Every structure is written in structure tokens, then in C-alpha cells.
RNA sequence: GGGGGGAUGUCCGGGUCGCCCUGGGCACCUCUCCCGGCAGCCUUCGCGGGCAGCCGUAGUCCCGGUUCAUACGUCGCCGC
């Protein structure tokens, strides 16, 4: 195979500014409940600061992205708050989840709730007061009352409401007699108390119920620099009624809640504290601080509430803007997103002894596109879709070439006020159609010369795009869940070929079997949107690929007397044990007239199906998941994508990338350990100690170890029915590989986009804090 | 003018010298940045091997981590690159063919 | 400039410049090599500036 | 953008204008940032930005 | 250690011996059983030992241990018989090298010890509860507090006192004081070398620093000037303990080592002087 | 770096003309020991000695791609 490195793609990373999860901590159950917990969709919430909020699913270590929503230009998110119902039970026993909703802030005036099924902003509510700058939920005891309190920058702590599906302002609780106070953080010590944290140096802790003031703890004046004010750049709640709150001059300052006093003041960070979390007992304490530093915080023994600094460490490479902690279902873990786009986790109850982990800063899905017969490759960001020429082969390079062999071809540039959502090219690169969450349009290319092709009948934007390998069918998935397929006619003239769509001929999904308490539990009908489109090398079967699992295809049935019907196999084609991160079709076809459908789901999980005989293929008979290699089998990313020869099929997540023989058969990390939602356990220089060991017997002889706690015939049948895979991570920031021409020879275009300190913000330095 | 030309030629030797390790381990495929030209570098500079021991903190050392090594040398690869893969690499037995725009 | 070479550090006060601050220090390099009284600081810092 | 309003001199006629913000999202307000941007660095300055570079 | 045998405390003497190079051995004495040369052996352990402690009475007593440490706490209470004079002992990795460490004990019974190794990477590791969490097959998680200033290794860490502060002294010259109850750190950074020694008087006032320039001198805690100075001849030498900064494989291994004769005169007019 | 080999590709006299080889030019992989460094285990108080050794080059499950900087005591004005 042949590749060419690319990095002069750049990708413009977004400075993270929030994170959340569905649940804040779920209850300890044992081995023989896992049946009361299973059902639970635990999701991760990231706003960057370009207005983009982004599901994640923890998936007990896998961390694969789901959901990507991108605002419009110029528009940012400060806050991210789920609200979780408790747990309601049904007539017969059975249990309804919490029904969860996500609310965000932008800088504005503004709380907007965001519709997760309808991968969009559901409501925009507003009152009268200044623009909001910190939020939270109150939380439970009442149960069918819950409601959001706002602090925001002339100092009103706006009070809204949230009763079913409704989102009004209701009130003021009061307002601060100083209008140069701004309220800077918020976090709620009981159900009737919120403590405030203002930037004239105060904390403020009102009582919701009369809206009154209860007291007003404050702080000095920094001593380090000038500018007299101290900020509360961030306060929680500890479980046993003690406030901490990250502040200005890199403290972080205990106040002990019955009084409403400071305890302790610790300075650790240099510059300001950014962020805090709790564990979900309260015993550790994470502290994020611009000096890109996190630190960790436990208990001192002997006294009570006394706290003291474990240690602290550079995990980002920008000031940490955010982090949200979560334990639950055997997981505890916190993520931390900074300002260098990139999420970091780490262990929470095995903090230093597991690794942390850094989540790939690129989005999931790939975001390169290539046609492989006019040699275009493409990218697309905020309003704006490049095009780039090769111009040439690589067989005539195998040094002063290059420059000019690679060519900056074609901006092409969207109106309006939305962002590119999705976007697909034809095989010659002459039809390429873009969708916001808005709109769709085509542009029709000419070798540059662009025009807009205009679609009709839609105006509600879509999620997804994918264009025909014969140029006839435009296929998009909108409002995430609806999917929708039009003809395009291509009428030749004198001037050359045009190209004229059809109305949207919608085609309906299948009515699966799902019980009402799921449907209704959780977050209900949240991964009915689906993930990936794929036609076949001959446009003659689609398929669509939901959140959950479920596969949907479509076959072609001709005389336009063309027509896409649903597939009688397609009640037989299963759900997968999870989401599948990759899905298509071969290019070479099969001998019975059938296709060879390639999936693979975010356990690492590969499969091959033949759709219209509804069953596996015999490959797929023969190799199951545990005859998969281990290089493959522990890579920890999520694969990107795949691209495609005869009999090789090479693979590629973020940092990895695979090959292997589909003709052929086949024959560090510890399996059986037990491990929290982040890396595997240290094994060179970690702070907690390895080996520790028991001596009886003086004479040092007997020593003891101590534990530092808190199918056969199938297979037979299988072979009764009777390598070539190569791996390598030498290609780290992987974003896009993409295949060209011009088991046979075949060209790629391996985009990597590593981050550096001309692509992140610029950092800043007082006289006092020069970093080495 | 001989204290002239003796200096001149004093640094295109070592510059030459420098050029033959450089090219050797480019053939090797150690990829480095390698002049190809009949012409001078500007700057007299080749990039030597990543060495195997760093320096800790406050002046102790240890072993290069390979993936520390990695990380230098996708640092030092350039921004467009023709790297093909052949057979005998898919087998395991010989490397890569690279040529990088010469920055 | 002696202290700074006296101290094993003039690489580390140099190595991370901006090209108008280096015309500057060529700039102070060029007018005060002609004097003898440290005419060998001044090509210290001329040998690691063309380095 | 919204048209400017026209003043014949004692009153105003101008046009309501809501068509900016359908169902997306709420547009960020640049003062606030600005604002909330200057908390942050209250005094301090950059480091030099980038390498060798006009 | 002065501990009890039946009913007359006396001195017992914990020696720490090699066997064999990389491991020793620990042998404890009386009067009586050094008069007659037979110890009571108490634990022999097999990595590269360096020291050998004991808190006050004889209860707990630990073990230095190049990256292990061995606890040791004695089996029976009151001591009633001499022969009865056993110390169960749990050993552990510490995660650096260990250079030099303090301990302090939480109190007449002793309730836990509070341990300082300051390891020879630079770091501080302070271990907050040993006896309470190796008193109970399994243990719960323990996690020492990391304070890292020093560069090189650091020579003394010691408790002060009533346990607030945590003082310490490297090779940078630099006399160190963690505040161990805030975050903050202040110090005396400019004496004459390396701070070799430390200790603090039975009260908490007097500090004392051996200097590596040969010297000590005894400070007044918040005075920080030398109340008493000493200063002896400060030339070459050749050290029989080598260094507390040559394990770990710096640029320069320190070694023992003389070059050159030293530069020495007798001045006339004062013969009794002698500048060198 | 040296000494040597086993095997990779090549032109000049070439050879019945093929397996390749000798004479010249050679670049790579493999083995071999001596060179420079590191570590462990025994003997010696040490000086030294003995033993099976690794590293001298390249890209990772995640990841050390970390951790680390030197105080107070009093400021201002003018003169020699």
C-alpha cells in the first residue's frame, strides 16, 4: 500500500469549557444485581467553546463518542448541568429510570435545553436580568419540583423552573447591593442552600426557600500580585456539610458548613484555581488550576476535616477549565477537559495506581472524505469545506516536488448562520452535498467552478450525508432518527451534465421490539438516531446504523420505476452488543449475487454479514472474538474507520492502525485484572506501594504476600465445516485515512493533526509565576 | 587568505562528515531530515540521533522511553511525506521507502 | 554577559529568541566587537549566535 | 444582519427582527466574553507567541 | 532503646549486620548479653540495608532498607520475660530510593508513628498512619504525601516537635520548612553548603545543622541566626559513607576523590594561623 | 570502531555458461569476540576479585511524552 503523511490539514481544536455526566453517582450493588443496573444509559457531556456539546459514552472503559451537536458561529457554552429524576417504579414491579434533560448556558442571557433525540436545541428561555455565567440543579430532599438557580454577572441569582418539559423563569431570589458583584460560581449544600461564589472576593451562601442571606463568607486580598479582589472561581460541596471552594490566589479554602467558617486554607497552584470535584463519599478532592496542574487532596489522619495536599501533577497542556467526577457500575473515574481540546480521565479510588488516560481531542467520526478517481481530498469545520488536489502519483517520487504536488484547490464557503453537520462526495468528486443542522445543499463541481445545486422539500437540516457510487441516490439522515433518500436525474446537454433532485421520498425504519420502561426510562428514544449510512459498491442495498445496535437496510427494486424497499432479512439481521463505530459494504462483490457487510461495534467487535441470506458469513462462523489478535483485542481506541482492499482490510482508530487477511484464519495488558474506568495498573514508579510482604519466622525465610485492598462442540462443529494481520501505532494523531487511485496496489492519504502551541491559545504570566 | 580558506574548509568538511552519518541512517530509515541538493543548507545542521538517555530532574538520567522517541520523531517529520509500505514490512522483515518535503 | 558565561547558561539565555529581539542582539554583537575589553565575550555570543 | 430603523423625527419605525436564532442556539454575547476573558488574565501578559516569525 | 525486662528499664543496643553483602541482619544486646557475646536476633532481611531506627521505649522499631522499608512492632505487650522479645515485621516498598528519614511518634503507649523518608530522587514521601494501617491476609490502601523541592537528593528530613512542620536539607544550600498544615513552604536558603545533618533539641526551640564545610552550628527557631557556631579544618575528604546524592546515576557521579595538594600557608606574625 | 565469516543487490575480463565465482568496486541483515557505558548476586572493613549479564539504537494498550528554582528583617530624599 502506499501513503502520503499529511499534516497541513488543520483542524481548529476548541478549548473544552464544560463537562457533566447523566448521574453524579450511582449505588453500590453486588455480583448478583447487575440485573437491577444493567438498563442504566450513563452519558458525558463536553461543551467547547465553539458551542459544540458532544455525548460520550464511558461504555465501563471503552470512552467512544456518540453524539457530536455543533452551534453556530459565534457562540460558545459555559455550563452543562444534567437533571436525573429518581428512580420511579412501575405497577408490576418493574423500574423506571430517571428521565434526563441537558441544559447549557452561552454567554448569554439565555438557558437553552437541548433536545438529545432530536440532536438539536429543544427550548430557549430568558428573563430579564444579565447574561448568566454559572448555573446548577437543586437537588433532591421536591421530587416532581426541582429547579435550576442562576447566578449571573449583575448579580440577580435568577431562579427557573422545570416541570414537565417546561422551562420558564420564574423568579428573583435577590440580587447583591453592589452591582460590580459577579457571580462567578455556584454549588448547592443541601436542598435549601445554595453558596454563591462572587467575584468580590465573597462567598455567599442564600437560603432558596425565603430567598434570603444567611451568610457571607469571605476572603482577603491576594498578597501576590496587585489587583486587590480574590475571585471564587469555583465552589462543592463536600457530603458531610463542608464547603470547598477553589479561589483566585491558587488556594482552596475548607469552610466548615454549620457555621458557615473557614477551616482550612491550603495553597497549591501558582496561578488561579479553576475547578474542583468531590468523591462521591468525600474523601478525595481533584483541584484543577490554570498553572495546568491538577492536584489531589485527601484527609489528614488523627484530626477531623483537616485536609492536606497528596500531590499534583501537569496532566493537560493548557490551563484545566473543567472536570466532572462520576463512580458508579464498578467505574470511578473523573474527566477533566482543559483549553488544548482534550479530555483527560483519570482514576478516582485508584488514583495513582492506574494510568490517567487523554481521550482524542479529534472528533469520532472521521471528518475526511475522499473521491478517489478525481484525487480530492476533503475536510470540513465551522462554516467552511476545503479541497485539496494531488495532482500526481507517488511511483514518480520513488524531494523538491512535494510543495507543489499537494495543492490548497477549493474553499467553498456556507452561508447562514449554522455549521457543517455533515458532508459527502461523489466517486468523480462532481456532486458533493453538505448539511447543517438547517439545511442541506449540493454543489455541483467542475473542474475550479461550484455551483449550488438546491435541494427542496427540506428546511429541518439533517445529521448525516451519503452520496451514491453512481451518482443517483442522495441519502441523509435527518432530525437524527428520520431517514431520508432522493433520486438525482442527470440530464446531459451541449454545455455539459446538470443535475436536477427529486422531492425527498422518505423510507420508514423498523418498528422494533423495545419494552415501555426503556423507551420511557433513561434517556428515551436517544439512539434511534443513527450513526453511520452506507450504500454497496453497486447502489443497489443501503444500510443505516443507529446508536443501539440495530442494523436497517434497504434493497432496490426497479421498474424511475426505481423504488427502496425494506429487506425481508432485515427483521433477522440482529442487534449488536453495542454501537457500531464502523459499517460497510465491500467493493468486491460475492459469487451468490449477495454482499459481504463489514461492521464492527465499539467492543472491539468484528463481523461480517450476508444481509440477504440474513445470517453470518462463514468467515464470520469461523472467527469469533476470542481467535481475533491481541494487538487488536487491547488497542483501547475506538476505530476511526476502515478502508478497503480484496482480501486486506485495514483498520485505523486514533493512534493504531490495522490490516488484516479476510481470506485467511488466525491462531503487555492483563486480561483478568480488575481495573477502574481509566488505563491499566502502574508497574514502574507509582506512589502507592507494590509489594508488600509479611515476615514470621525471624530468621527471614518465610516471608507472606498481602493483598492491598479497600463452546467446545461449537467450535467443533465450526472446524468440522472446514496469518496475515499487521499492526503498528507509528501514525499517532490519526484523523482521516482515505483511499486513492490512479489484493491490489492502492493509495491512501494517512491526515494526522497533532496539536502544538501555536494551534492551542496563548497562555499568560505575572511577574511571579514564570513556568521553567 | 590560506587562515581564510582553511576555516572555510574546516566547516564544510565537518558539515560533509556530519552528512555521511545523516545519510547512512537515512538509508537505514532512522527518518531524519536530510538534505538532497547540490547546494548548501543555509544553516550548516543536520539532525543527529535521538539519543537513548534524557535528563531528569535535578540532574540524574535514565533510558529514553520508546514512546518518548516516537514522540520526537513524529516532532520531526515534516508536513507532507510519502511513506509506502511493502511487503517484506507487512511480513515483518524490511522497512519503509520515505521521502518528506524538503523543508 | 560574564556572569551568564561564568555560569554554564548562555546557550539557555539564547536558544529561545524571536528574530527582532536576535537583530538586536547581532545589532549590540556588531557594535561592540571593536573593543578589546571584551572583544572574547562578544565573540562567545557571536559563535553561538551563528550556532 | 436587522435593518436600521428610520426616523421621520418624532417617532421611530423600525422592524422587529427574531429571525436570527430558529432553533439552533442563542448567539454569545462578546462583551461578557470579553469581560469573563479579562477576569482571567487581569494583568498578566503572553509569553512570546510562536518560533521564529515576523 | 530503653525498654522494660521485668521491672528495671535499661538499655538495650539494636545493631544492624551483614551477613552477606546485599542483605544484614538485626541483633539486640544487653549489658549482660554483649558481656557475653549471644544477641537475640530479631530479623534478617535481603535488600541492600542502610539504617535501623527505633521509637521511644522499643515498640516500634523500623528498618532502612535500600527501596523497602521493614516496620517492626514488638508481639507482646509489657514485656514480661526477656526471652520474649519478638518483632513482627511487615516490609513495603517505598517508591524512590531511600536517603535519610524521620520518624515521630503519636502518643505513655504509642498510639501510631508518622514516617518521613526523604528519598533520594528529591522527594519527601510522608507516610501518615503506619502502625494503624499494617495493626490488621490484607491491608487497606496507604498513599504517602509527596513534597518535592529539592533537586538533588535530599541529605535530612525531620519532624519538629509538636509535629507542625516538617523541616528538611539537601545539597542546594537551602534549609527548608514545610508547613504540613497549609500548602506553603519557607526556608532559610543561603547558608555556606550542603545541609549534611539536622536535628532538633528536646525542645522545640534549638534547631542544629552539621554543615558539610565541617561545621555545625545551633540556631534559635525565628531568631535563625547561629547562637553557636563551630568550624573545624574543611579540606579534602575522603568520606567513608560516600554520598547521599551519588546513588541514582547523576551527569556527574560525585566520587571520592583527591586531585590536587591542598593550598596552605603559615603566616608569620601569627604563627598560631594558618590560611589555607 | 577492528577482525573475520553466513546471506542480500550490482557493473567491468568474464566462464561450458550457470548454481555463482575469482580479480576490482561495493551498501544492507546475521554470528563472533575486543571497546565505551550501565546494572544485579557473592567475597573483602575497603582496595580489588568472581558469576550469568544487558545497552551502544528507534515510533507506544493507556502511560515518567511526568516530578523539580533559593526567605525575612524599612522605605523615601538629598550630599560627599
Given at each position: 500500500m502506499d501513503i502520503h503523511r499529511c499534516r497541513f490539514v488543520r483542524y481548529p481544536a476548541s478549548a473544552i469549557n464544560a463537562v457533566a455526566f447523566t448521574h453524579s453517582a450511582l449505588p453500590v450493588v453486588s455480583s448478583s444485581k447487575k440485573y437491577l443496573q444493567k438498563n442504566i444509559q450513563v452519558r458525558l457531556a463536553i461543551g467547547r467553546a465553539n458551542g459544540d456539546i458532544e455525548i460520550w459514552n464511558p461504555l465501563n472503559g471503552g470512552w467512544y463518542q456518540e453524539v457530536i451537536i455543533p452551534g453556530g458561529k459565534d457562540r460558545s457554552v459555559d455550563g452543562l448541568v444534567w437533571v436525573t429524576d429518581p428512580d420511579e417504579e412501575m405497577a408490576d414491579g418493574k423500574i423506571i429510570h430517571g428521565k434526563s434533560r441537558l441544559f447549557s448556558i452561552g454567554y448569554t442571557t439565555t438557558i437553552t435545553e437541548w433536545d438529545l433525540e432530536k440532536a438539536r436545541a429543544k427550548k430557549h428561555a430568558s428573563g430579564q436580568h444579565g447574561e448568566i455565567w454559572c448555573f446548577g440543579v437543586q437537588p433532591l430532599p421536591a421530587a416532581q419540583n426541582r429547579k435550576l438557580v442562576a447566578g449571573t454577572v449583575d448579580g440577580n441569582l435568577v431562579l427557573y423552573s422545570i416541570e414537565d418539559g417546561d422551562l420558564k423563569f420564574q423568579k428573583t431570589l435577590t440580587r447583591t447591593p453592589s452591582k460590580k458583584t459577579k457571580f462567578v460560581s455556584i454549588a448547592f449544600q443541601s436542598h435549601n442552600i445554595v453558596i454563591v461564589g462572587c467575584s468580590n472576593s465573597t462567598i455567599c451562601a442564600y437560603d432558596v426557600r425565603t430567598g434570603t442571606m444567611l451568610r457571607q463568607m469571605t476572603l482577603g486580598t491576594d498578597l501576590t500580585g496587585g489587583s486587590k479582589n480574590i475571585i471564587v472561581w469555583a465552589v462543592k460541596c463536600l457530603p458531610n456539610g463542608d464547603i470547598v471552594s477553589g479561589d483566585s490566589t491558587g488556594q482552596v479554602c475548607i469552610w466548615d458548613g454549620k457555621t458557615y467558617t473557614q477551616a482550612q486554607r491550603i495553597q497549591s497552584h501558582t496561578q488561579d484555581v479553576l475547578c474542583l470535584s468531590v468523591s462521591a463519599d468525600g474523601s478525595k478532592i481533584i483541584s484543577g488550576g490554570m498553572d495546568r496542574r491538577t492536584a489531589v487532596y485527601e484527609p489528614m489522619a488523627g484530626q477531623s476535616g483537616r485536609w492536606s495536599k497528596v500531590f499534583h501533577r501537569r496532566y493537560h497542556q493548557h490551563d484545566v477549565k473543567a472536570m466532572a467526577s462520576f463512580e458508579g457500575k464498578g467505574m470511578s473515574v473523573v474527566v477533566s477537559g482543559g483549553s488544548d481540546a482534550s479530555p483527560i480521565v483519570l482514576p478516582l479510588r485508584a488514583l495513582g495506581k492506574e494510568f490517567h488516560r487523554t481521550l482524542p481531542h479529534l472528533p469520532q467520526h472521521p471528518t475526511v472524505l475522499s473521491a478517489p478517481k478525481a484525487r480530492y481530498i476533503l475536510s470540513w469545520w465551522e462554516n467552511e469545506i476545503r479541497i485539496w488536489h494531488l495532482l500526481n502519483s507517488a511511483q514518480q517520487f520513488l524531494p523538491l516536488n512535494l510543495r507543489k504536488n499537494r495543492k490548497f484547490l477549493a474553499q467553498v464557503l456556507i452561508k447562514g448562520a449554522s455549521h457543517i453537520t455533515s458532508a459527502s462526495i461523489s466517486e468523480d468528486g462532481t456532486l458533493l452535498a453538505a448539511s447543517t443542522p438547517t439545511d442541506v445543499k449540493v454543489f455541483h463541481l467542475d473542474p475550479l467552478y461550484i455551483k449550488k445545486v438546491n435541494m427542496t422539500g427540506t428546511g429541518l437540516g439533517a445529521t448525516r450525508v451519503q452520496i451514491s457510487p453512481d451518482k443517483r441516490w442522495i441519502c441523509w439522515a435527518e432530525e437524527g432518527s428520520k431517514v431520508m433518500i432522493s433520486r438525482v436525474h442527470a440530464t446531459e446537454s451541449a454545455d455539459g451534465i446538470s443535475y436536477t433532485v427529486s422531492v425527498p421520498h422518505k423510507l420508514h425504519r423498523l418498528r422494533r421490539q423495545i419494552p415501555k420502561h426503556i423507551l420511557l426510562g433513561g434517556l428515551g428514544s436517544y439512539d434511534r438516531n443513527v450513526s453511520q449510512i452506507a450504500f454497496s459498491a453497486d447502489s443497489r442495498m443501503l444500510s443505516v446504523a443507529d446508536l443501539a445496535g440495530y442494523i436497517d437496510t434497504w434493497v432496490l427494486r426497479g421498474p424511475a420505476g426505481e423504488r427502496w424497499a425494506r429487506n425481508p432479512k432485515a427483521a433477522m439481521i440482529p442487534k449488536l452488543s453495542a454501537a457500531p463505530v464502523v459499517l460497510s459494504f465491500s467493493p468486491t462483490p460475492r459469487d451468490d449475487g449477495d454482499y459481504d457487510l463489514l461492521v464492527v461495534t465499539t467492543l472491539k467487535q468484528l463481523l461480517i454479514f450476508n444481509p440477504l441470506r440474513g445470517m453470518l458469513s462463514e468467515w464470520s462462523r469461523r472467527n469469533t472474538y476470542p481467535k481475533l489478535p491481541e494487538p487488536f483485542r487491547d488497542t483501547r481506541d475506538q476505530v476511526k474507520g476502515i478502508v478497503w482492499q480484496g482480501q486486506r482490510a485495514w483498520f485505523y482508530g486514533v493512534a493504531s492502525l490495522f490490516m488484516f487477511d479476510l481470506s485467511q484464519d488466525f491462531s503487555k495488558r492483563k486480561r483478568g485484572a480488575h481495573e477502574s474506568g481509566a488505563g491499566s495498573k502502574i508497574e514502574k514508579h507509582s506512589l502507592v506501594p507494590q509489594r508488600i510482604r509479611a515476615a514470621s519466622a525471624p530468621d527471614g525465610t518465610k516471608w507472606e504476600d498481602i493483598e492491598m485492598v479497600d463452546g467446545s462442540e461449537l467450535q467443533r462443529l465450526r472446524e468440522e465445516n472446514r496469518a496475515k494481520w499487521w499492526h503498528t501505532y507509528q501514525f499517532r494523531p490519526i484523523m482521516g485515512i482515505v483511499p486513492i487511485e490512479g489484493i491490489p496496489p492502492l493509495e491512501v492519504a494517512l491526515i494526522e493533526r497533532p496539536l502544538s502551541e501555536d494551534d492551542l491559545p496563548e497562555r499568560y504570566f505575572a511577574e511571579g509565576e514564570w513556568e521553567r | 587568505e590560506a587562515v581564510r580558506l582553511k576555516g572555510v574548509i574546516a566547516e564544510a568538511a565537518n558539515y560533509a562528515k556530519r552528512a555521511r552519518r545523516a545519510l547512512a541512517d537515512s538509508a537505514k530509515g532512522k527518518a531524519m531530515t536530510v538534505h538532497m541538493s547540490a547546494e548548501l543548507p543555509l544553516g550548516l545542521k543536520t539532525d543527529n540521533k535521538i539519543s537513548t538517555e534524557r535528563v531528569r530532574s535535578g540532574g540524574e538520567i535514565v533510558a529514553r522511553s520508546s514512546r518518548q522517541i516516537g514522540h520526537f520523531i513524529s516532532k520531526r517529520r515534516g508536513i507532507y511525506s510519502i511513506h509506502r509500505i511493502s511487503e517484506e514490512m507487512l511480513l515483518g522483515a524490511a522497512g519503509p521507502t520515505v521521502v518528506q518535503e524538503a523543508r | 554577559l560574564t556572569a551568564l558565561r561564568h555560569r554554564s547558561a548562555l546557550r539557555e539565555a539564547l536558544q529561545g529568541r524571536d528574530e527582532l529581539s536576535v537583530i538586536n542582539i547581532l545589532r549590540w554583537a556588531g557594535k561592540y566587537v571593536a573593543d578589546p575589553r571584551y572583544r572574547s565575550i562578544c565573540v562567545d555570543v557571536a559563535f553561538h549566535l551563528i550556532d | 444582519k436587522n435593518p436600521k430603523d428610520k426616523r421621520v423625527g418624532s417617532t421611530a419605525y423600525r422592524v422587529v427582527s427574531?429571525?436570527?436564532?430558529?432553533?439552533l442556539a442563542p448567539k454569545a454575547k462578546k462583551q461578557s466574553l470579553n469581560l469573563k476573558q479579562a477576569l482571567l488574565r487581569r494583568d498578566r501578559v503572553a509569553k512570546p507567541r510562536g518560533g521564529f516569525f515576523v | 532503646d530503653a525498654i522494660e525486662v521485668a521491672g528495671k528499664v535499661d538499655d538495650v543496643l539494636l545493631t544492624l549486620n551483614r551477613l552477606t553483602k546485599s542483605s544484614a541482619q538485626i541483633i539486640a544486646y544487653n549489658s549482660k548479653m554483649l558481656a557475653t557475646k549471644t544477641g537475640k536476633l530479631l530479623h534478617t532481611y535481603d535488600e541492600s540495608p542502610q539504617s535501623l531506627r527505633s521509637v521511644a521505649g522499643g515498640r516500634a522499631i523500623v528498618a532502612a532498607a535500600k527501596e523497602a522499608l521493614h516496620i517492626g512492632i514488638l508481639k507482646t505487650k509489657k514485656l514480661a520475660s526477656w526471652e520474649e522479645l519478638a518483632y513482627r515485621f511487615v516490609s513495603f516498598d517505598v517508591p524512590d530510593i531511600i536517603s535519610t528519614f524521620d520518624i515521630r511518634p503519636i502518643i505513655a503507649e504509642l498510639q501510631d508513628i508518622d514516617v518521613a523518608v526523604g528519598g533520594a530522587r528529591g522527594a519527601i514521601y510522608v507516610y501518615s498512619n503506619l502502625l494503624a494501617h499494617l495493626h490488621t491476609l490484607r491491608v487497606g490502601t496507604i498513599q504517602p504525601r509527596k513534597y518535592h523541592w529539592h533537586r538533588r537528593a535530599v541529605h535530612s528530613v525531620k519532624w519538629s516537635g509538636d509535629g507542625n512542620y516538617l523541616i528538611s536539607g539537601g545539597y542546594e544550600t537551602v534549609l527548608v520548612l514545610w508547613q504540613l498544615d497549609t500548602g506553603r513552604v519557607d526556608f532559610l536558603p543561603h547558608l555556606s553548603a550542603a545541609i549534611e545533618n539536622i536535628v532538633v533539641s528536646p525542645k522545640g526551640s534549638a534547631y542544629a545543622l552539621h554543615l558539610d564545610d565541617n561545621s555545625a552550628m545551633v540556631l534559635s527557631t525565628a531568631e535563625m541566626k547561629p547562637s553557636m557556631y563551630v568550624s573545624g579544618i574543611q579540606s579534602l575528604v575522603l568520606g567513608d559513607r560516600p554520598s547521599k546524592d551519588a546513588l541514582v546515576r547523576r551527569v556527574w557521579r560525585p566520587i571520592d576523590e583527591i586531585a590536587s595538594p591542598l593550598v596552605a600557608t603559615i603566616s608569620p606574625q601569627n604563627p598560631s594561623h594558618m590560611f589555607l
Open positions: - | - | - | 427574531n429571525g436570527g436564532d430558529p432553533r | -
